[PDB]
Structures are given as structure tokens and as C-alpha cells.
């Protein structure tokens, strides 16, 4: 949101995405569950001994969501 701070018709179109990339940051600053994925059915391994599947890939996921939002405006 800090980075994102008649030819004039594109302003109202880009403002929707620029303002849309801010509501996901209002989840009480933590939310404790910002991860949407899971691992497979483990039989004999170290599944619970590791972090989790989505725990090591959700930060880049939500980090890239805003990039997709920004890259899909001008065209």
C-alpha cells in the first residue's frame, strides 16, 4: 500500500485496484491463519515435525497477489 501511494478515465479504473490492494491488510495485523494450502496424507515421515506445507509458501503467495492486481490494470 505504501508503494501504491478523455485520457483521464484510467484514474478511476486504477484507483479501484489501488484501493483493493489494502483491505487484506485489515485482518487485525496478524490474523494467525493467512495460509490457504495443505500437504498430503503422510504415512511414515516427518510431517508434523516440519512447519507445514502452506506455512512455507503463503507469504510469497499473498505477496504476489498484489503484484497480479497491479499488473492487470493498464491493459
Amino acid at each position: 500500500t505504501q508503494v501504491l501511494l478523455x485520457x483521464x478515465x484510467x484514474x478511476x479504473x486504477x484507483x479501484x485496484x489501488x484501493x483493493x490492494x489494502x483491505x487484506x491488510x485489515x485482518x487485525x495485523x496478524x490474523x494467525x491463519x493467512x495460509x490457504x494450502x495443505x500437504x498430503x496424507x503422510x504415512x511414515x515421515x516427518x510431517x508434523x515435525x516440519x512447519x507445514x506445507x502452506x506455512l512455507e509458501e503463503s507469504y510469497s503467495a499473498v505477496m504476489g497477489i498484489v503484484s497480479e492486481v497491479e499488473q492487470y490494470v493498464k491493459v
Partner: protein, 268 residues
């Protein structure tokens, strides 16, 4: 043509990334992935900016829907309810859940304009009234209204689903008839999709928002419910062939001191 819109509602993935890939990506962990469409407008790309919002999850998605729907956007907003056939209970509960989220969006974000209420509700009665004719009495429609349409993924896996837990027309036709129940009650439709098959999504989205769609019940694997093929009679007809006539119980069917004080008696 003004600014068209599309709200795809993926239910924990459910091939939504694959669906937007086959139609026209980093990842998806929170939702609200603003995407634009460059759909052939029968001549060229006439800048049919049908904006697509990829909403997934429930962790504060109401603000995402608030920024994803403007004031004048409401008539050209093709909401899409998506769930995958690999988990039938997920589709059955998630379709009601997406309809509830849509009703929350209508009861919270659509309520401030008064003129849009008296105009949009009449246009909703017109749309659900003009959803069914021109195909060649009354279904228990709810109060939800916006351009509604459902999309079910993992449809080219009927052999896998029958090898796992269906193995009878009861489960498959039960899913088909109950999703038809929800589509007739919501004034919606349902276009299935498959892996490298069933190129039928973009048809109703370009059709309703102003390239037509087919309907199939013979294949029983690629079932398309167009705008108008959801009635409160064929639902009971479909779940009657060896299946119970309107059941309410088959849903779950297809779904130091411490130790020393303890040892103090051992010393005796």
C-alpha cells in the same frame, strides 16, 4: 459498452487458477486477484474490460468484495460460484455459502443507494424472469439477485469418483439434481468445466452481460445448466432413479515434589 465485471469465487483452489488459465499467475493465498479480460467481441478485441476478481477464502474478504464492486458496477457483475466435484459436500455447502456471501454483499453494500434498490430489484425480477424463456411455471426463487451463475470443476473424473465412493447413479445424479436445486432457487445457472475439455465457460459470460452455451444431460459427466435449465420438477425426477425422493438425510451420506510424593510410600 461500459465496464463489465466478473467475480470468480474459488473454494480453496478448486481449479480456479486452471480455469482462468484455460480461459485466458503468481499464486493464491488470500484472494482478490484483479484480472482483466480481452475477450473476442465477435469482431476484434473491443476492450471488453470484463474485470475478474479471484476471491478465495473467508479471512476478511468482505472488504475485497467492497472494492471489487462499485455503485454503477452492480448490473454488469457476473458473480461466479466455483467448487470442485472431487469433494461433493464442498460444492453442496459452498454453493449455499457463496449465495450467503452474495446476500451479505447485497444486504450491506447494495443497501445505500435507494434508487438502485427500486430499480435493481425490479431488474432482478426481470432477469430471473428472463432467465428461463426462449429455450428450444415458477421455481422457488430466493431474494438474491445480480448476474448469478455457478461453475463446477473436476468433471472429467466421473470414473474416479465412481471408483472411490459413488459407484451408482445415486451420488452423481444426487449432486447434479441438488446443484440444480440451488441453481433454481438462486435464479442462477451452472456451467461445468474439465481439464482440457468443456470449453463452455466464456459463452454465458459474454452472453448474459450485454457465443451461446449448450446443455447436456446425456453425457452425465459434462452437465451444463444454462440460464433456464433449472426447474423444481426435474430435480425430483433426477434423484428418483434408484435414489430417495427428496431426502434430508442423504446429505451426510454423500458427504521433584510430584514424583517424590508419589514414591513416598515406596520407602515405607
Amino acid at each position: 459498452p461500459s465496464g463489465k465485471n466478473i467475480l470468480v469465487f474459488g473454494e480453496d483452489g478448486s481449479g480456479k487458477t486452471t480455469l482462468m488459465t484455460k480461459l485466458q499467475h503468481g499464486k493464491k493465498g488470500r484472494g482478490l486477484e484483479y484480472l482483466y479480460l480481452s475477450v473476442h467481441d465477435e469482431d476484434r478485441d473491443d476492450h471488453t474490460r470484463c474485470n475478474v476478481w479471484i476471491l478465495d477464502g473467508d479471512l476478511y474478504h468482505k472488504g475485497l468484495l467492497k472494492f471489487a464492486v462499485s455503485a454503477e458496477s452492480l448490473p454488469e457483475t457476473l458473480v461466479i460460484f466455483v467448487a470442485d466435484m472431487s469433494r461433493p459436500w464442498t460444492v453442496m455447502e459452498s454453493l449455499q455459502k457463496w449465495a450467503s456471501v452474495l446476500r451479505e454483499h447485497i444486504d450491506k453494500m447494495k443497501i445505500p443507494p435507494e434508487k438502485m434498490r427500486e430499480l435493481e430489484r425490479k431488474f432482478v425480477k426481470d432477469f430471473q424472469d428472463y432467465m428461463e424463456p426462449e429455450e428450444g411455471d415458477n421455481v422457488l426463487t430466493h431474494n438474491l439477485g445480480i448476474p448469478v451463475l455457478v461453475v463446477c470443476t473436476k468433471c472429467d473424473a466421473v470414473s474416479v469418483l465412481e471408483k472411490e465412493h459413488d459407484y451408482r447413479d445415486e451420488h452423481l445424479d444426487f449432486i447434479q439434481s441438488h446443484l440444480r436445486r440451488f441453481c433454481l432457487q438462486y435464479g442462477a445457472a451452472l456451467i461445468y468445466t474439465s481439464v482440457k475439455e468443456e470449453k463452455n465457460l466464456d459463452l454465458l459470460y459474454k452472453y448474459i452481460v450485454h457465443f451461446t452455451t449448450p446443455a447436456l444431460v446425456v453425457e452425465k459427466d459434462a452437465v451444463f445448466i444454462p440460464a433456464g435449465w433449472d426447474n423444481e420438477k426435474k430435480i425430483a425426477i433426477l434423484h428418483e432413479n434408484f435414489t430417495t425422493v427428496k431426502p434430508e438425510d442423504a446429505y451426510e451420506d454423500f458427504i521433584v515434589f510430584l514424583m517424590k510424593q508419589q514414591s513416598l510410600l515406596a520407602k515405607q
